[PDB]
Amino acid sequence: KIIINLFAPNLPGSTKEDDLIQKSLRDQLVESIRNSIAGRNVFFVDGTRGAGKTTFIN
Amino acid sequence: KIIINLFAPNLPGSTKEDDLIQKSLRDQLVESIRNSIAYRNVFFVDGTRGAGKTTFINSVVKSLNSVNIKCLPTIDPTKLPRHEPILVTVTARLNKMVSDKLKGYWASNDYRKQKEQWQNHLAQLQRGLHLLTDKEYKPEYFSDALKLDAQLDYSIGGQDLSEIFEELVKRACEILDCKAILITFDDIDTQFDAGWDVLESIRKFFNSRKLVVVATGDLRLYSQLIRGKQYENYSKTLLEQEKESVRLAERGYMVEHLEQQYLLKLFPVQKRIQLKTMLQLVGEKGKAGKEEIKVKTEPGMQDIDAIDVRQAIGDAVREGLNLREGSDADMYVNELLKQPVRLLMQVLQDFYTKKYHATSLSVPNLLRNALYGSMLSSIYRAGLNYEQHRFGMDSLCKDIFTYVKQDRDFNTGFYLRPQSESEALRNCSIYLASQVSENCQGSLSKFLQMLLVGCGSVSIFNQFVTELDREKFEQLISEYVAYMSVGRIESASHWANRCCAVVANSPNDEKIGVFLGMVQLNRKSRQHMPGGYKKFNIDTENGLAKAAMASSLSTVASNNLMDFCSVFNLIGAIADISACRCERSAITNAFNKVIAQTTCIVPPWSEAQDDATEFSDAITKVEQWLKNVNEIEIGIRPSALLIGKVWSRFYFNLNNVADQHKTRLYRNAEHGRMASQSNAAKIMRFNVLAFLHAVLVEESLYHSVSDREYIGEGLRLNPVTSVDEFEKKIKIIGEKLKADNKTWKNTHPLFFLLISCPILHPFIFPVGGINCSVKALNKETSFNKLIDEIVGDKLLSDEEWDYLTKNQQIFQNTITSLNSSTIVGASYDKDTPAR
RNA sequence: GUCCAGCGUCGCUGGAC
Numbered sequence A: 001k002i003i004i005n006l007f008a009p010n011l012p013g014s015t016k017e018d019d020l021i022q023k024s025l026r027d028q029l030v031e032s033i034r035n036s037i038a039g040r041n042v043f044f045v046d047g048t049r050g051a052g053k054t055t056f057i058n
Numbered sequence B: 001k002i003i004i005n006l007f008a009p010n011l012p013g014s015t016k017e018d019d020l021i022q023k024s025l026r027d028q029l030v031e032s033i034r035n036s037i038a039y040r041n042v043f044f045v046d047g048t049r050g051a052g053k054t055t056f057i058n059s060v061v062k063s064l065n066s067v068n069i070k071c072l073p074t075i076d077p078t079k080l081p082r083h084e085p086i087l088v089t090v091t092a093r094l095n096k097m098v099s100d101k102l103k104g105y106w107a108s109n110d111y112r113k114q115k116e117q118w119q120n121h122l123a124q125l126q127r128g129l130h131l132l133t134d135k136e137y138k139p140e141y142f143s144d145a146l147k148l149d150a151q152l153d154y155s156i157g158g159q160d161l162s163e164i165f166e167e168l169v170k171r172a173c174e175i176l177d178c179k180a181i182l183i184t185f186d187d188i189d190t191q192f193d194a195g196w197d198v199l200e201s202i203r204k205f206f207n208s209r210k211l212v213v214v215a216t217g218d219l220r221l222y223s224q225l226i227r228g229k230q231y232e233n234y235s236k237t238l239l240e241q242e243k244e245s246v247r248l249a250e251r252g253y254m255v256e257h258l259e260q261q262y263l264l265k266l267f268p269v270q271k272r273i274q275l276k277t278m279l280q281l282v283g284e285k286g287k288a289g290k291e292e293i294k295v296k297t298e299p300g301m302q303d304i305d306a307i308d309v310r311q312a313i314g315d316a317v318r319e320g321l322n323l324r325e326g327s328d329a330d331m332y333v334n335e336l337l338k339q340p341v342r343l344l345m346q347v348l349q350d351f352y353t354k355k356y357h358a359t360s361l362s363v364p365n366l367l368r369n370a371l372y373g374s375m376l377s378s379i380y381r382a383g384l385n386y387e388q389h390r391f392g393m394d395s396l397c398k399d400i401f402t403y404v405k406q407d408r409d410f411n412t413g414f415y416l417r418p419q420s421e422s423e424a425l426r427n428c429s430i431y432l433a434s435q436v437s438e439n440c441q442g443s444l445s446k447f448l449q450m451l452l453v454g455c456g457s458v459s460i461f462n463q464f465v466t467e468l469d470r471e472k473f474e475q476l477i478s479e480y481v482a483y484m485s486v487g488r489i490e491s492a493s494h495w496a497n498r499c500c501a502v503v504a505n506s507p508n509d510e511k512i513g514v515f516l517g518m519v520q521l522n523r524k525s526r527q528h529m530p531g532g533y534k535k536f537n538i539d540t541e542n543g544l545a546k547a548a549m550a551s552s553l554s555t556v557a558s559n560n561l562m563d564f565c566s567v568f569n570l571i572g573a574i575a576d577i578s579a580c581r582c583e584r585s586a587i588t589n590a591f592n593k594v595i596a597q598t599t600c601i602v603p604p605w606s607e608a609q610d611d612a613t614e615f616s617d618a619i620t621k622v623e624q625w626l627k628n629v630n631e632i633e634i635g636i637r638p639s640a641l642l643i644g645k646v647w648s649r650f651y652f653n654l655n656n657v658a659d660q661h662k663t664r665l666y667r668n669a670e671h672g673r674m675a676s677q678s679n680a681a682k683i684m685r686f687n688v689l690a691f692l693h694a695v696l697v698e699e700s701l702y703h704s705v706s707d708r709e710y711i712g713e714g715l716r717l718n719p720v721t722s723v724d725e726f727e728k729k730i731k732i733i734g735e736k737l738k739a740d741n742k743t744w745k746n747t748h749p750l751f752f753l754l755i756s757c758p759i760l761h762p763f764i765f766p767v768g769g770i771n772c773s774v775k776a777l778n779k780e781t782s783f784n785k786l787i788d789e790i791v792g793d794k795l796l797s798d799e800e801w802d803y804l805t806k807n808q809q810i811f812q813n814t815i816t817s818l819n820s821s822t823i824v825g826a827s828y829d830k831d832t833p834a835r
Numbered sequence C: 001g002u003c004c005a006g007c008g009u010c011g012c013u014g015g016a017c
C-alpha cells in the first residue's frame, strides 16, 4: 500500500516529494532500458492532458 | 521454412540468415549479376514503403562478398551532406579499398609502380571537380581544356570528366584483381533531392562495362520526381500565357512522354524486380503460396510449436475483435496482410509482448492499446478522438457517427466493414471494431445502451437523408448531434425521449399515429367516438404493470403535449435498471426518472391497499432478475457486428409495420379476435416483438460462445402481422439445444437474460391485442407454452388466458386499458371485410 | 386442392393439411 502523508514536517506545497504515484510506471520504463542493452533504442513519452511533464524526465 | 522471432528487436541490422524472409528473391538476383558481365547493366529492386528494402540490399551485398566482383560499402544518399556530389563520395569509398590492397602486396617492385600510377589518376581527377560544382564559366580554365596529354592520348578533347573517371575504374580493377565493381545505392524514400543527384550521376558517369549499379526504391517517388524536373525546362513566361484547355493538354502528354522514355532508358524493363508483399509469400488458406512462414509467441519456443502467420493473425483478430470463425473474420486478416511489412510486426509484436506480461485478461484492450499506436496517423485523417485517458463509453458513440458520415455510406457503415475505397478509412475501420468490442467486455446491459446510441443515432438520420445542397449538410449534421446529444448523455431513455420529437417532426403521409417503433395515445377527449373506444386515461392501468406502462410514456412539447408509446423508452429504460446493483433503492427511481419532469421541445430543424407497496411486488422480481443479470452477463463476449446487424433487422421490421397498418384502422377491433384488425395494443405489441425477434436471429448467427449456430436451414423472415414466424424459430432452437445437451443460458446468453425481463412481460400478451384466431390459437398456446421453459417461473397461473382467449377478472402482468385507447387520424368509415 | 403467412409495384414467394 502506498502510504502518503499530508501534514509533512516541512509541509511542502502539494506534498510532492519523490515518485509520487508514477513509481510503478517508472520501474516499468527503467527495467525496459536495462533489458534493452542486454539498432534503434529511442523511447517516447506522450504529452498527457497538456501537463508540463518536464518533472517526469527529471 | 522461414522462422521469425517476435522477441528479438527485429532491427534490419540484426536480421540473420534464418530470420530473413526473402531467400528466394535474393537468390534470383545473386545469380543474375554474375551472368551479366560474363558475356546499361543497371539493376533496380522495387518495393513499396515499409517492404524491407534496406534489409534486402544488405543480404545481396553480404552474399556477393563471400568471374569475381568486389562490392563497395552501401551508400545512403539521404544521410550525406546536402552539397556533396555523389561522384566525390564514390571515389573516397573506392580509394579506401584501393589504398588497402596496396599495403597487402608482398613484392617491393610491384608496389611503387602501381601506387604512383594510381596516385596520378586521383590528382588528374581532383583537377576536374571544377566542372561539377560551379555556377559560371571562366576563361582562365580554357587553356587547361586545350591541353595534350601523354596519358592514354585522350581521343575527346577538353576535360570530359566521364572519360577521366572511366580509366580510374579500369586501374582499380587491376589493383583489386576483379572483373567489375558494383556500386549499390540505398533508397531516397525520405527525400526528393538525394534522388535527383543519384539519377543524374548514373546517366552520365557510370556507363562503362566495369560497373554494375543496383538502385533501390519505388517508381512512384521516382516518377513524381522526374516529371517535376521536366516542367522546369519550359520557359516560365510561356506558362502564364497560352493556358487554354487545348494547349494545357498538349504539353501534359508531351511531359508524360518524356517521363516514361527517360525512366525506361535509365532502368531497363528486363531488369526491374518487384519485391513480394506478405500476401504472395503466404497466399490464401486454400490456395498455394510458394513459401512458408512461422512465428514465435514465446522465448525459447520450440520450432515445432511455431504456427502459421494466418493463425498468428486470425487468433488475434478472432479473439481480439470477438468475431465468429468465418468469412467476416477472414476479411480482416486478408486486408491486414496487405500492409507494409514494417507495420505488420509492430501490430503483431506489440500485441503478443503485452500478452506475455499480462499473465505475469481483457484481451480486446491489449489489441486496442497496440493497434492505436500503429494506426495513429490514419486516425487524424478522419478526425477521431485522440485522448487516451478519455476512452469513455460515450466517446465511441461520437466516433462511429462521424466515421460513417465520412465514409459516405449509411446503409453499410455501421457494419464497420473495411470496404472503403480510401486506404485511410480502411485503417481506422478495424480500430473502431476493436473499440466496440473492448468497451462491452460482457458489459452489464451497456450493449443494450450502446446498441441504441451507437447505431440508432446513425440510421435515424437517414430520414433527413431521404429528402435532402452542400452548405446544409454541415448545418444539420452538427446541431443534430447537439440536439440529440450523442457524445454527451445521462441515460439511454434520455436519448429515446429526444427521439420522439425526431420521429414526430414529419409524420406518415396518412397522418396516423403509427410510426417507426412509435404509437401515439390520445390525451384530448375526441368527440363522439364510435364503438367502445374511450379516451386514454392514465388512471385505469393496473398495478404491477403500471411501472412497465409508466416507462412506455414520452410526452413531447410540440405546441401540444402528446404522449408517445415507444419501444425505445422501453428498451432505453432497461439500461437504467441494469446499470448497477448495490441497493434496492434506485431500482424504482428509473420507473419515474423520465415522467412528470422530462419535457422535450420541438427540434430546431422543424422548419414548420395503501398503494405504497403495490410496486414492491414487482420490485423483488426485478431485483432477482438483476441477480441473473449480474451472474451471466459478465460471461458474455459482445461483438462489433451484432450491433450493426441487430439494428438492421430491427429497422426494416418496424418500417414494414409502419406502412402495413395505415389503412387497416377500423371499428369492431376493440377485442382483437382475428388478424387484419389493427388496435393500439397490437401495434405496440409488434414493435416489442420485433425487438425480441431481431435479437434472436442475430445472436444465433454471430456471437463468441455460440461456435456453431443453432437454427433451421430455411428462410429467415420477420413477424409483421402474425406471431408464427417467431414461434417456429423457437421450436427449431428447442430440440437442437436439447439434442446437443446444451442449455439456453450458455449457448444463447444474450436472449436468455432479456426474455425474463419483468418490464417486457406485460407487453408480450396484451389482453385485447392477442388474436382469438380459432385456427391460429394453436400458435399462441404453443408460442406461450414454449416460453414456460425458457423462464422457469411460469407465472401465468393458467387463468389469465381465459379472459383474453374467450373473445370480471383480476390481472397483474397484463395491461387491460390500451385496447380502448384511440389514435390520432383514425377515421372510422369502413369495417371488417368479410372472411 | 383450399387455407394461413411472407416480399415487390396486383405480381411473386414460403409453410401446413
Ligand SMILES: Nc1ncnc2c1ncn2[C@@H]1O[C@H](COP(=O)(O)OP(=O)(O)OP(=O)(O)O)[C@@H](O)[C@H]1O
Binding pocket: B004, B010, B011, B012, B015, B019, B020, B021, B022, B048, B049, B050, B051, B052, B053, B054, B055, B056, B186, B187, B189, B341, B342, B345
Ligand atoms: N526479413 C525480415 N524479417 C523480419 N523483419 C523484417 C524483415 N524484412 C523487413 N522486416 C521488418 O521491416 C522493418 C524495416 O526494415 P527495412 O528498413 O529493411 O524496410 P524499409 O522501411 O522498406 O526500408 P528503408 O529503411 O530503406 O526505408 C524491420 O525493422 C523489420 O521489423
